[PDB]
Structure formats: structure tokens, C-alpha cells
Amino acid sequence: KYRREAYHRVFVNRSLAMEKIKCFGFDMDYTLAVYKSPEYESLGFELTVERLVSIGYPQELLSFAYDSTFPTRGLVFDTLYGNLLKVDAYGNLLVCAHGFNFIRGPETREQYPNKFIQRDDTERFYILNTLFNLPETYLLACLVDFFTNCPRYTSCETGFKDGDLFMSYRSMFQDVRDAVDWVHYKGSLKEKTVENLEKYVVKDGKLPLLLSRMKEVGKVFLATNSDYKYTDKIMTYLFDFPHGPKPGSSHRPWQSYFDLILVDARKPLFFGEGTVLRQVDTKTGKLKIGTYTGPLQHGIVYSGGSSDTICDLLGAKGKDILYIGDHIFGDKSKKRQGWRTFLVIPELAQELHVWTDKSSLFEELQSLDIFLAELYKHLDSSSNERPDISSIQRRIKKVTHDMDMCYGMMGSLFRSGSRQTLFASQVMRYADLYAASFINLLYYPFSYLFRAAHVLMPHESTVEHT
Amino acid sequence: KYRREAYHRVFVNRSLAMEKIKCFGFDMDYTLAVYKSPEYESLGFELTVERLVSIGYPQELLSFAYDSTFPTRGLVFDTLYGNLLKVDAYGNLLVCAHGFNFIRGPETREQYPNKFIQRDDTERFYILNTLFNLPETYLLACLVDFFTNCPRYTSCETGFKDGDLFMSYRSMFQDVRDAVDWVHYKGSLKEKTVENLEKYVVKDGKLPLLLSRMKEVGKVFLATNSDYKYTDKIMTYLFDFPHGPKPGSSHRPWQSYFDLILVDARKPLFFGEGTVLRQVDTKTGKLKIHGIVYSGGSSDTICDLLGAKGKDILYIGDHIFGDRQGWRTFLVIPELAQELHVWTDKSSLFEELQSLDIFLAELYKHLDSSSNERPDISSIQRRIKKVTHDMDMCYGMMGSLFRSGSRQTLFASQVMRYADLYAASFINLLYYPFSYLFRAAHVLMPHESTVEH
Amino acid sequence: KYRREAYHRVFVNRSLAMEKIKCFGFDMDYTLAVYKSPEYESLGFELTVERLVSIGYPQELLSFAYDSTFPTRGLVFDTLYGNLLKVDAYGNLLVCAHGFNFIRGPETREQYPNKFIQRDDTERFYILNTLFNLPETYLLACLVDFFTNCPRYTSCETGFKDGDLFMSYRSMFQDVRDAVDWVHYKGSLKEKTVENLEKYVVKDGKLPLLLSRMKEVGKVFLATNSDYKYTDKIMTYLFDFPHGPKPGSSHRPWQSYFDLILVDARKPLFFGEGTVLRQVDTKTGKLKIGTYTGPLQHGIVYSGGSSDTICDLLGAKGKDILYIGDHIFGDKSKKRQGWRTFLVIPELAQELHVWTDKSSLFEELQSLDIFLAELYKHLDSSSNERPDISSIQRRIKKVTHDMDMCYGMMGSLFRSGSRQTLFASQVMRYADLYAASFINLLYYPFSYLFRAAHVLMPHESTVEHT
Amino acid sequence: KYRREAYHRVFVNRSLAMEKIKCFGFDMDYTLAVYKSPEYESLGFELTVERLVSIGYPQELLSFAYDSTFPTRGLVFDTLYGNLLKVDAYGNLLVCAHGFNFIRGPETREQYPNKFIQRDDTERFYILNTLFNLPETYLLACLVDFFTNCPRYTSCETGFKDGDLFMSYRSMFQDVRDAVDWVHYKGSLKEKTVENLEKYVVKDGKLPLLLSRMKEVGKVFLATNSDYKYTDKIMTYLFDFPHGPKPGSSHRPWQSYFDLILVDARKPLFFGEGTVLRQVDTKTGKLKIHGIVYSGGSSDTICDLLGAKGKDILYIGDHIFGDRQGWRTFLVIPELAQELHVWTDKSSLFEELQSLDIFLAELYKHLDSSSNERPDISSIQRRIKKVTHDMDMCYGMMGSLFRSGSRQTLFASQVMRYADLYAASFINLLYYPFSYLFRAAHVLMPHESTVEH
Numbered sequence A, C: 001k002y003r004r005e006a007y008h009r010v011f012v013n014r015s016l017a018m019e020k021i022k023c024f025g026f027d028m029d030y031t032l033a034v035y036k037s038p039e040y041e042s043l044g045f046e047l048t049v050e051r052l053v054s055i056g057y058p059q060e061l062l063s064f065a066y067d068s069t070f071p072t073r074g075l076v077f078d079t080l081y082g083n084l085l086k087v088d089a090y091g092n093l094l095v096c097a098h099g100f101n102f103i104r105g106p107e108t109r110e111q112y113p114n115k116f117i118q119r120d121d122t123e124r125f126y127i128l129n130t131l132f133n134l135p136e137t138y139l140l141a142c143l144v145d146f147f148t149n150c151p152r153y154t155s156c157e158t159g160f161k162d163g164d165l166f167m168s169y170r171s172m173f174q175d176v177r178d179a180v181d182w183v184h185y186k187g188s189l190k191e192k193t194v195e196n197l198e199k200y201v202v203k204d205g206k207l208p209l210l211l212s213r214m215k216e217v218g219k220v221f222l223a224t225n226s227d228y229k230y231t232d233k234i235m236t237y238l239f240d241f242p243h244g245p246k247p248g249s250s251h252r253p254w255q256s257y258f259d260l261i262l263v264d265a266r267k268p269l270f271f272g273e274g275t276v277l278r279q280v281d282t283k284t285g286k287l288k289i290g291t292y293t294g295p296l297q298h299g300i301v302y303s304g305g306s307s308d309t310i311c312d313l314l315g316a317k318g319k320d321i322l323y324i325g326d327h328i329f330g331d332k333s334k335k336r337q338g339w340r341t342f343l344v345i346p347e348l349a350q351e352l353h354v355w356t357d358k359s360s361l362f363e364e365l366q367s368l369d370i371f372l373a374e375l376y377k378h379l380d381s382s383s384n385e386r387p388d389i390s391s392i393q394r395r396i397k398k399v400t401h402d403m404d405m406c407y408g409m410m411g412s413l414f415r416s417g418s419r420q421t422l423f424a425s426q427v428m429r430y431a432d433l434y435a436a437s438f439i440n441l442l443y444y445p446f447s448y449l450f451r452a453a454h455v456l457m458p459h460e461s462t463v464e465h466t
Numbered sequence B, D: 001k002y003r004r005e006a007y008h009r010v011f012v013n014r015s016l017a018m019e020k021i022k023c024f025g026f027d028m029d030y031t032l033a034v035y036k037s038p039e040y041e042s043l044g045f046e047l048t049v050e051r052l053v054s055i056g057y058p059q060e061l062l063s064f065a066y067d068s069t070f071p072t073r074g075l076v077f078d079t080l081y082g083n084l085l086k087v088d089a090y091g092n093l094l095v096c097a098h099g100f101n102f103i104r105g106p107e108t109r110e111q112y113p114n115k116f117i118q119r120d121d122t123e124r125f126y127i128l129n130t131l132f133n134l135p136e137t138y139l140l141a142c143l144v145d146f147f148t149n150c151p152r153y154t155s156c157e158t159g160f161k162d163g164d165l166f167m168s169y170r171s172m173f174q175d176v177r178d179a180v181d182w183v184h185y186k187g188s189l190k191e192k193t194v195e196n197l198e199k200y201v202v203k204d205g206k207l208p209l210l211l212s213r214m215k216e217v218g219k220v221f222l223a224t225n226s227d228y229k230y231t232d233k234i235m236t237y238l239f240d241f242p243h244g245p246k247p248g249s250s251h252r253p254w255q256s257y258f259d260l261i262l263v264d265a266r267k268p269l270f271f272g273e274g275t276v277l278r279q280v281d282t283k284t285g286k287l288k289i290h291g292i293v294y295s296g297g298s299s300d301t302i303c304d305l306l307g308a309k310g311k312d313i314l315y316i317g318d319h320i321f322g323d324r325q326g327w328r329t330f331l332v333i334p335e336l337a338q339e340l341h342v343w344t345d346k347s348s349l350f351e352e353l354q355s356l357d358i359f360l361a362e363l364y365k366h367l368d369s370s371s372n373e374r375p376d377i378s379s380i381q382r383r384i385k386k387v388t389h390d391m392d393m394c395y396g397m398m399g400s401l402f403r404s405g406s407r408q409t410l411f412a413s414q415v416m417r418y419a420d421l422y423a424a425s426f427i428n429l430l431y432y433p434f435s436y437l438f439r440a441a442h443v444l445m446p447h448e449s450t451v452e453h
């Protein structure tokens, strides 16, 4: 089976015929504009901490340093017990860290009977899905750790006491949640970023190449939650090369690359009723009092609206639209037709790296497993042998832990041992296509037919056809 | 990697060390007592139909014949539009049949825009999970087909009119659901079964062998939703061989193979608050106002009485439940034997599809976003569609219980959720030692399965 | 039947036994703190207009002047056709004004077939219920009027054109909606108010009298959506008299008058899940990082939380609580027990005035109606008389119009001719008690039993018992 | 103010100038043809019960007897808890009866916290609006009472068990609803009625008088949901007197009193898209593949054919509908005669309550927020409660159709919404000229009714 090389690959959950794609839609933040790691995370982490201290948190916080090897995306915060939880598709605990203490094993059941959380309880548990939640993920584990080991504060089941003031893990998390928000919305994250774009934002000469090739076979639009003043600063940088689409061609502005540009979308509300469609005034940045209810005829920039507006303006409907982005929405659904989805998952490059330069650890595990099969090979329910496998067992735990440590300290984004993460299952739900970058579409023709990979059940994967 | 034979295998979702199991718990109906197919299904189908007619349904119903090649387990009935839906793990439609007309293609979006349903809407959709829903699965498609194509009746979006008497499918479905229930609780399904046990119920000389070996290494209990009178008749037949545990050994009675026997359990409530524990009088069959045999109670009662904790108990059964500590689970899935058969006696169809797929990879091999080539692959496409269609038909007309095309069924996902272990019959434990350690198979994401080290 | 005098009366929709009331809860804005009319409305109207122009609206707007005799509360804006609608309990049009043009009669059915709106369509129609919507009510009728009669703009069914820009009535209204919000939230309404409190805010020496008498028989709390810095400035002023509860008693601070003080409630969310309960730091104004999960022991000020929190802290539940306020919420409902309601309706004083000093117009109408009864008295279906009543008819229209003009130009808040307004019906739904001011509770004992008045159907009111 | 006599009065919600009316439209069932009470209700009750038994309900049902003093119209059935609810205009509980046990007091909040329901939840609650729901109103309270108090059955929050066969009230209610429907559409209600018209249907020598006077000043049409065969039999009886319009005049046939006759109308759909207009053959009774008599069609069809516009049409009927121009409405409410009777033959009870209320006003007269007085008024309270209770009982056991205590019913509010005019019988139009101008009564808010000029 011919397969393109791993770093260039688009992966398929649900089959998609590209020939039938009429529009390519793009998310900006963390899609078109990939923020540099760990630079950008650290910046958010710093501004958030500074925001917390200024509104009254201890000053020891001022000396925390974002550590990129702790968090993985998709962890669950238990606001009742203050834990960071890695869980599987169904709610089973995989990892449970209180501060920097990984609680593990039997001592879990005193707080999680059946090692299980009822994920539906969107009041107790908060899923940290987005790449913007990386800073607050590490930060939460920091605060819990700080307050736990600080003598001026008394540790309790659900929070901490100081005097006759109590600070629940729920309240602290709200402070944190509110701090990040503020930093993105009133704080200096945006300006600190644009003041030093080459430190924070990746740029790639194939980006214009791809989008211009895309525009030759179908329409292309931009639908971002950011505002125009910011989008502009960003989109200008992403396109600032001494050339245009290819080396040798003259530099065109980034607006030229889009049949439709929309900002202030307010996704996810966008995909439902949305907001009123308005039009931005490029000179001032403010909105025009009137809009332009007319058809596609572009030097125009839109604000707000709805996904249906896009479909009206480009004269397409959902199944003909490929939406490209970093964020996992939900449902699929509600009576209007929905777009197909290409999910960008940046962590995928490191994930794939481990899956290759650590071949040695997999074939040990392979062989260790082979070896067990043998120890039990000629046995059945009549036999009384209790073969000692406790030496083999503990060896497995070390090779997998050593493998885990390669990802980060909360392990792989997708897997832990045999089990898939809740994240892995959200991806396989929401995403038709996925890859490390959307740029990988450069290595496939627009006539390509993406065929879904077969996810096999145990009885499928361990049983041969002949 | 050494692997036992396919029909003998226990399959693993979550790893389990059998060494650390203290008790084996057993479901009776469709677990210990496997009803013969298609005989039993047919019996239920008839008894159900006759009940419907007795309470006013047309007499044309009386001439339906249960057809075991139509239904598969785990289908979803839409009471709004009257469709049987095969959907995937997340709610995407795979198959949509109205009566016996299989709708899907573009014309699906007229009723399911986005080809998608919300399982959440228990008011609208009903998942037919259990082996007892097999008759009514077929019956539902029969009635919709009948009323739809009978000139005495005019078809509507959400039901049918008799004159301008209107019957919603929601109302019809409830009648059908109520008829089955009636048949099991007030009807003659149980007695017609015990009156002909060899016609309706499988029996295996290995059942005593397993349960006795199990009792040598741990406690064994029976926790069934049936009553004692039925259980007695059923458990007696199941153990009625001229020998005991093994050939040559004297016949022991079936109560002797169980440290604890419990009936009238009322699962799923059993696993929650349960009921008041009562004690059965064997002689009378009635309840009283060690020497074994309880009624009602709760899963805690079991744990108290045998002195076990949740994680030390392997519960064996055919039913997929939901979710104070909980048991490990061995799920029995009878269809698996036939499911595995197709996966084996059809190697030729799989390696065609394989080969057919390879071929595509070539046609696009040296291409990228600069290429202008649109290679015509429609003969390949149409060929692929036919081979998978032929492959489906081997399963039944609603296709495989677990998968359809590239996708897993909602049923498959429930298994991978609820079951630690699963196999075709629990008897396959006969082929593994009680020191065995079951290691979970890795379910791979696309980027894992299509990328080598 | 002994009845207290009209200006002092509390009116009853649903009976209430006051003896069984354990807590009095208070809204601040437009309840405890009554803003002066038309002073305050005008101020909002000015700041809103100035906000609109600054973001690009025509400058002619700068010369509008809030006219207090136009708006009534509870009108409905049709964002599709740009109309202000006065409707009845069921959706029937009573008044329909496009700009300052009252469309009236038969010409209504071209836009409203059956003279009826489907009130449920919370996408098309927007109810202007709150006393804060008075400025924008008049302003909307102004803009529609301005744009209609201005030659640079082309009037259309659903908006206006300028060039190839279109401004729908929906978009304009959103601008307006957003402008008011901004003015309350980022603008200078709050500061302009506190800089001149005696111009904007009523103060009354019986306010402390009532609340202190209330505190002798049950607990009293404050639950406002405003923040502490503002509440303080306001509550201080409301209580700034040279004395305390009565003349002769020493001045106590306003906090002393409340068993519980809560700000930032975020009503209506408050009455549901609410927010996390936090505690305000009086010195700084900011929130304490920790709270105080302890029982009622007061020098404390709370922020956020939920209505249940109040019930926990005061150890009461809903039917034992009388909530006093200016805003009409909804449903009754959701499984927690709900408080009883005293609705403050300031306009009630003018409403009652007309109902008294215009006795002359009612007894004319009385007599004119009497007179008809006679013209038809000795007739039945056999008789062929077509008595000319067209002189009498048109006389009625003038006396009722002259009566209407006494209220404002959109008429009575509650009534029009025979019909009740949608507002009247919202009051009778949500309010157990109502009056012009909550201060009227001063004239009733805490042992008083409020007996609901009987709202009679036609066959009840026009048929005697003997 | 001159006012005609109470039993003769037309009451006005929205003003209407009769002078400007071009057409009179007539509903037949329970409008033109008023069925006798309690005879007709009882007939429906029996036929319904017998249907239920035939499809499997206990035989104890066969000995129920319709009791006309229990139900009033406009009650709300809660299919979740099995309660009959009398609620006010906004959803507040007034009366709550489970079987024949009237629950309300504090013990209501255990099921209705805030003593409140959301009418919005058509999935849970069913408003029993029509005069045809009177039998099933009583029947529903009978069944709940029976299953609740019968030892063969165990009571649950949402239903009852027969053994551990479970029946939700939702399911029961649908059966009851379906039984009534069946009885009207496939059952023998119609034929048992026409076989004894003098027992079941009122007739008035004034019906021709009115309709003929109406035809002298405007068009008259008949728009009924019944078929021609039934309508014929019914309309013939209604007009069967030895004279015509007045005594002395020769008998004209009933078709002659109508410019347009329409059957099989399918209201409410009639008022929307309706159906295809068809034409009836009088001779055959069947449909054909001026001289009058249509089937189906739409309200526009009426307007087209008579050349009228919506606002020019007075539609006369017993049914409260909802909501391309619309008709004015005369709503017939038979119960109004008895409702008005109590409001008159019980002056003594009203002026006691009056007086009792006056008395309270005195006890608090010279009091204010400074007073320490807590005057004991509990004997007055308890006396008030009894007098209103006695007053209720005059209506029935669910009290007045329109009000209960100070509050208006949900039924009363629907009337004030849907009806421009209402009266006990449409015959009361006989007492007003066609030049009459109906002026709406003013419904007053508390501050209006308790404050004089």
C-alpha cells in the first residue's frame, strides 16, 4: 500500500472525496497562525500569573515558570477535589495528579470509587481541550501544589483555609479561568504577541502556495473569532515573504487570497443563530453603520453573521465545505447541513516522533507480551500451574513508563497503555480529517479520495482472515 | 504471538488478572441458558403477534413469519418517522430502513439532515440492545411495511390513517413494546419453552465441567431475573446428563454447583438499591414469611454474603448495563460465532477489497496539489461498493452487528465500554487457566494503524 | 369596605399572609434607589446618542432631546419593520407607530394581517420591559423617524439604503441595544449619576423608618446586580439624613440595616445556578481571594452566588421570602422553592392620578354607553331599525383619545380602551403585590393579610347576584 | 345601564358591530346540535369503557357509572404523576386530584414544588378542553382511583404494577385517549345517537326562527367536521317541527336555511391548508368523482364562494381554536347557564363572603407598621374557607369552570383570548338586533377595581 511519509500525512476517520469540495474555510488562531511552543504558552502563563497576583494572589506565584513537559491537552479538572485527571473515552481515570503528586493505584478509590468520573457533570468537571488551556493546565497544578505545601494555609478536602476564609478549588479555578480570559480580552497578550511576531508565530512559505492552489479549484474563506485589527497584523506577517504564491512571483496582499473574509464570528454561536452580519471598515477598524446585502464581489470584510451566511454568499452547502481548524466543536447537528472537518493537531508531530525513534521500546513490549503467551500456551482450566510472571510484569511497567515520559509527564495526548484518551475519542468524533498541520494538504491532489482507516475491535485485530 | 483457536477465544477490552478473581457470577437467560436460534425468536415473534391481534390489530398480522436473516441486534427505532436505524458510535446513520425499503443515499437528508441522530432523545429513539428485542426488531419493520403498503391504510410522515383514525408510529411502537412485555410476564412464553426444552434450549456437557472447576478456585453464584420455578426447570435441563462434572462421575443436582443462588433479582435495580432480601422455599416455590436460595436483594447482599469486594467479582452475562464498588464483566455475545465465521470463510472478499484499495493508492501515488490529473476511479468505486454489499449480505440484511463499512456500530462501542471480557459463549473459559492474565488489545487510531516503527 | 387611600395602597393579585413572612429582600436600582424622571432617562438618552454618533451615526442625532411624553413601558419593537407596537395580553396590536407616525386602522393589516403578532418570536420582536428601556424606546422611534425623512437615505420595507450599504432595522436596533449596554457598563452613566445624586436620585426619610421596622419582625437582605463601589455610593446617599430610623435617633450606616448584603448577583442567572459565592473586601472594593463559608455573622458583604445561598444563610425558604423589586422576571419555576414578589411600578402614581382627576371623562363615557343601551333597548332580531349611532360613536373616540393623551402619547401602561396591555398581564403573572413604591408597606401592619382582588370576566361583571 | 335578562345575554370580550357582518358560520356538534346532559356524556363513557375492556382492561371497569357532578371542562391531566389538575391562567395549581383523593395543601409541593406547571410541556400535560373530553375526564380519575385502591395492583409514583408488569399513567392515558377516538371514528357512538335522537339531542323551535332571520340580512353556511349522512340525520331532527321558521309557516327542509353547506371539514386543518374541495352526492351519500353541499376544502374556499373577507365573518361554535385573514368568533359555552344560576341563586353566600371581607378590613383599619396588634382572625379565616367550599360544591366537585377562589381558570383565559362573543347558546342572538353594536366589558386590574373616581 503506497503511503506518503508520516510527517506529510493526512489521516482519515471518515472517508472524503476531495473532488466534491467546493470551499475551503479557515480558522486563524492555531490554524493558519501557529503559535510557537513553548514561547507562546509561557507568555500566557506569565500574563495570567501577573494578573492573579495583582488581584491578590500570593507573590510566590511571581516566581513560577511555565514547564512545557508537564501538561497534555484534554485533561479534566475536578473543581471539587482539585485534581487534574487523564481519562479514557468512557470516564475511567488513567492519571490523577493532585498538584505534582500523582495519586495512582488503590488510593484513587477513596475519592473516585470505581476509578470513574461522570463526565456529564459540567459543574464539577472541566475539560481542558483547547491549546489555549495549556498555560492554565500547568498553572492549576502549580497553585494546588503551592497552597498544599505552604504553611500559612490549611489543606482540606475541597480547598484551603486561611483564617476564617475558605478558598474552594472551585473558586480558585474560577479565578484562573477568569484571569486567562482577561488576559486574552483586556490584557496584553495580543499586543505582546504582535510586538514580537517572529518569537511567537511560525511562518511558512508554502502557506501562500497552498492557498493559491486551493483558490484555483474552489472558493476559500476566512472565519476567525479574532477582530480585524489583530487578524490583519497576523495575516500580514504570515504572508510577509519577499514573494507571492511561489518564489519568483510578486507579493500579493493576504486579502487577495480569500474569496471571503469574516472576523468576529463568535464561534460556536456562529454555527447556530450567530449574530447580525456586519461589515468592517478597513481604514478605521470599526464597523460600517450599514453593511452590503449584495452578492460575492470582494474588497469586502465581514463581521459576525452565521455559517449559513457563508453558504449563502459562496452558494455552497455544508457537505461541499471543508472547514480547517484547531478547535473541536460539538453537535451534527441542528437541521442545517454541516461542513466537513479537517482538524489540526499540532502535538501530532511529537506524537509521531515517539512512535518512530522509540521503536526499541515497542518491540520489547511486543516480545514481553509474546513471552507471556508462551508461559500460558499449553494450559487450560484443568491445569493448576500458577506461573510466576511478576518479574515480567514489573518490567512492562518500566518500559511503558519510560515510553510515557517521552511524551510529557501526563503522557500521550491520545493513548495510555492500551487505552484511548477522551481526547482521542473527541477527535475521532468531530474530525473527518486530521494532521499536524493543514499544510499537509500540499502533498495530496484535489482529486484525492480519502478512505477512512478501519478501527478494529479486539476480535477483529487478533483474528486473521485465513 | 501464540493465540488459541478463534472459536475458543476470550477477547479482551480491559486487562484482567484471573488469578485475583474470588467469585464468578452468572446470569441465566441467554447466558447459562442459551436459547436456540431461530426457534426461540420465532416463538416470541408468534406469541407477540397473537397478542397484538387479540387486542385489536389486523388479522393479516397472523400470517407473518419471523425471518432471522433480517434483524441484527442494536438497531435504533425512530418512533417519529418509523425507521429502523443502524448508526455508528457517535450517531451517524449507516442504514435506514422504513418497513423493508432501505432509504439511504441523498434521500436520507430529507428526514435526517446531517445523516445524524441524537441518542440523547430517549423520547424519540429506542435502542434495541437485547437478544429479546430480536423478534420485535423484525416485527417493527413488518408492521411498518404492512401498514405502508396496505390499501386499507394511508401513509403519513409520522404514522398511518385507518379512514381518518390516526396511529402514530410512537403509539404503534409502544403497543409492540407492551406486547412483548406482556408475553414475557403474563403470556405463555415461559411455559411453551419448558414444555419443549430440547427444541428451545442448548445444552453442553461442558457446563458442569466449567462450573465445577470454577468452584474449586472461588465462589460461584447465580443471580437471575427469573423466578425459582422457571430457573428450576431450566437449570435442571441444563444439567441433565447421565454423568456429573465429567463423564464417569455421578450426577449432582444443579444447586450443588453454586455457593449462592438468587432469583427475582430485578436487575438493573439489583445493582442499585435492589429490593428486600427474601428467602425461597424450594418445596412450595413460594417465599418464606447455609442451605441456599434467595429472592430479591442487592449486589451488596451478594458481596456481604460471600465476603468479596467489587473488583474481585467476575460477573458473566448477556446484558449490557450502564454506569459503591462495581464488578468486572464478562459479556456473552452469541452472534460472535457467526460474526467470526464471515471474517474467516470470506478471505477472498477481504483481500479483494485489500487489493482494490492498494490499487487506488497507486493511481494517486506520484500526485500532489500541483497535479491536474483526475484519474477515473468510478469502476473501482462501484466494484468496491458491490464487494462490501456482498460481504454485508453474509451477515444478514442489516449487516454486521459490530461494523458497517469502515465504521463501528453503536453496539460495538457499547461492548468496548461495558465489557472487560467478551466471547461467543462463557464456556470458552474452559480453555484458559485461572492463573491467566488477560491483556487488552490496543484499539488504534488511524495515525497509529497506518504508521509503522 | 375600609380602604387606605390610593397613593398609599398596596395592590394584591394573589393573597399573601404577611405574618408568615420571615425575610424581606430588596432590589436596589429603581427599587430602593428611585431615579428621578425625566432627569435620569434624559441622561441615558444623551449618553447613548453620544455613543452612537462617536461610532459613526449622523450628527443630527446630537440635537435630539429626550421627550418623556412619548414612551410607555412595555412596548414591542419589530426589528423587521421598525415599528413600536403596543399589544394586548394575547398579541393583538393596539398601537403601531413607525417613527412618529401612528399607522392605525386598516393600513395595519398590510404588515400585520389579523392585526396580530406572534409574541413568541424572540428573534423578530423585542419587549421593552425595564425602566432602563425608556431612553432607547424613544430613541428608536427617533432614529426611524430621522432616517425616514432624511433625503440622503432611501426608505425600504426593512431598513434604509445609502449607496450600496443597507442598514436593516434589526442592525440599527442592535447598535442601539449595544450602545445602552456600553453606556451602563463602560460609559459614564454611573459616574455622572454619583457626581450629582440630588439631581438623579430620590431620597426619603421614611426609607430607614420602614427597613428598621422590618428588621424587628424578620430578616432583611440586599441583592443587587450593581457592584459594591456603586451600591455604596448609592446606599450612603439614600441614608444620608441628619438622623437614623426616626427623627431624634442617631445616624447609623446603611449596612447596619441589612442582615445580609449581596452584590454582583447576576440576576436572573442568580435565581438559577447562579455564580460562585464570593466575598467583597470593603476597603479596596475588590473580592477577597477566600470567602467565609460560615453562618450569618455580619460585617460581611457577598458577591455572586445564588438565591439558594440566601435561603441557606437566612435559614428560610421561598414562600417565607418577600422579594421587592422593579423588574418582572419569569418562570415558577424549576424545582427549588420560589420567593413571593412585591413589584414596584413607579408609573403607577401618574396612572392613579388620571384615574382620579379625570373623573369627568369616565362619567361621560359611562353615560355615552348608557345611552346606546337605550337606543337598542326595545329591539331584537325581528326589528329592522338601523339606529344611527355614528354621532355618538365618534364622540367616544375623542373622549378616549383625550383620556389617552393624559397618560402619554402611547397611552396607559396597563390599558387601552377596553383592553389590557401585555404589560398588565405580565404584572398580574409575576407579581403577588404591587404599588408605586415599596414604601407603601409603611401603612400596613406586619400582621396584615393581603386578599387578592377578583378579576371579573364579562359575564361576572355585568351580571348582579340578586 | 339597560341590560337584557341574564340567561338571554350575549357577553362581549372584544367589541363587534353586528351591522358589518356578512356571513354567519355554524359548527354543528355541540353548537347547532346540543347533546343532552348527562345522557350523552354517559353514552360516551360506557362505549369508551366497553372498548377498553375489549382490548384487555379489567372487567371491574364495566361497572363504573358516569357521574356528572365530578368533572368540569378544561382540566389538565399530568401523565407523569397521574393527576387531574385545575390550574389558573398562568399555570398555578388550584386543585389537584389523584383518583378521587384531592391532594392540595402543603403536601402538593412534594410533587409540584412551587405549586406550578409548565403548560408548554405537551409531552407531559394534556389540556382537556372540549365537551367530548368530559367522559374521559371522569374516566381518568376512575381508573387512577381503581388501580390505586385495588389489591391486585401496587401503586407507583408514575404508574402501577400488575405483578411486576408496569403500566405508566402516560401509557394508560394514551389508551384512554385512543379509546374515545376509536369510539367516535369506528365505534357506535354516532349510530346509538341517531337511533334515539330525542334522548340525546336538544331541539328548539327557535333554531329556524334565528337562522331564517339571519339569512335575510347575510349569508349562512354550515361548516361541520361530521359527514353528510350523520349531518343529514342530525340536521333533519333539529328542524323537524310541524311548522317552518315561525308557527303557521310550512316546513322547509334544513338545507334551505343555508347558503352553503360543508361537511368532512377537518378543522383545525380546515383553517390552514385544508384539503381538496369535493362535492357530495346527496342521493348516494358518497362523493362525486348553486345546488349546494361540499366536502373538505378550506376556510378560503368559504370566503371565495360567498365573496366575504375574514373580518366580515362571524363563526359560531363550541370549540376554542388557536392562532391570511381570520373570522370573528362566537363561542358557545353550555355550562354557562348553570354557572350563571349559582351566581344568582346563591346571593346569600356571596354577601356573606362580602361581609366577611368587610369585617377584616375593620380589624386592620387603624393599623400600620408601628402597630404590635396581631388580631386573631382564624375563625373568620376558617369560616371564609367553608363558605367558598360550599359555594364550589354548587358547581360540581372540581368547582366552577371559570374561577376558583379569587383566581380565573386556564379555561377562562382561553375564552377571553379566543372568543369575541360568548353565551350559553347561540340562540341568544334572537334577542339582539342585527344593527346591535357589542361593546367589550372592561376586565379590571386590582388597582382599577378597588379605586374609585
Ligand SMILES: c1ccc(-c2cccc(-n3ccnc3)c2)cc1
Binding pocket: A393, A396, A417, A418, A419, B013, B014, B015, B016, B439, B440
Ligand atoms: C485496563 C486497560 C488496559 C490495561 C493494560 C494495558 C496494557 C498492559 C497491561 N498490563 C496489565 C498487567 N500487565 C500488563 C494492562 C490494564 C487495565
Ligand SMILES: c1ccc(-c2cccc(-n3ccnc3)c2)cc1
Binding pocket: A014, A015, A449, A451, A452, B381, B384, B404, B405, B406, B407
Ligand atoms: C464511512 C464509512 C465507511 C466508508 C467507506 C468504507 C469503504 C470504502 C469507502 N469508499 C469510499 C469511497 N470509495 C470507497 C468508504 C466511508 C465513510
Ligand SMILES: c1ccc(-c2cccc(-n3ccnc3)c2)cc1
Binding pocket: C393, C396, C417, C418, C419, D013, D014, D015, D016, D439, D440
Ligand atoms: C376590541 C376591543 C375593544 C373595543 C372597544 C373598547 C371600547 C369601546 C369600543 N367601541 C367600539 C366602537 N365604539 C366604541 C371598542 C374594540 C375592539
Ligand SMILES: c1ccc(-c2cccc(-n3ccnc3)c2)cc1
Binding pocket: C014, C015, C449, C451, C452, D381, D384, D404, D405, D406, D407
Ligand atoms: C389565590 C386565590 C384565591 C385566594 C383567596 C380567595 C378568597 C379568600 C382568601 N383568603 C386567604 C386568606 N384568607 C382568605 C384567599 C388566595 C390566593
Ligand SMILES: [Mg+2]
Binding pocket: A027, A028, A029, A030, A031, A325, A326, A327
Ligand atoms: Mg482556532
Ligand SMILES: [Mg+2]
Binding pocket: A037, A346, A347
Ligand atoms: Mg503544542
Ligand SMILES: [Mg+2]
Binding pocket: B027, B028, B029, B030, B031, B317, B318, B319
Ligand atoms: Mg440474561
Ligand SMILES: [Mg+2]
Binding pocket: B327, B328, B329, B417, B418, B419, B420
Ligand atoms: Mg465495567
Ligand SMILES: [Mg+2]
Binding pocket: C027, C028, C029, C030, C031, C325, C326, C327
Ligand atoms: Mg432593579
Ligand SMILES: [Mg+2]
Binding pocket: C037, C346, C347
Ligand atoms: Mg417613570
Ligand SMILES: [Mg+2]
Binding pocket: D027, D028, D029, D030, D031, D317, D318, D319
Ligand atoms: Mg363542534
Ligand SMILES: [Mg+2]
Binding pocket: D327, D328, D329, D417, D418, D419, D420
Ligand atoms: Mg379570534
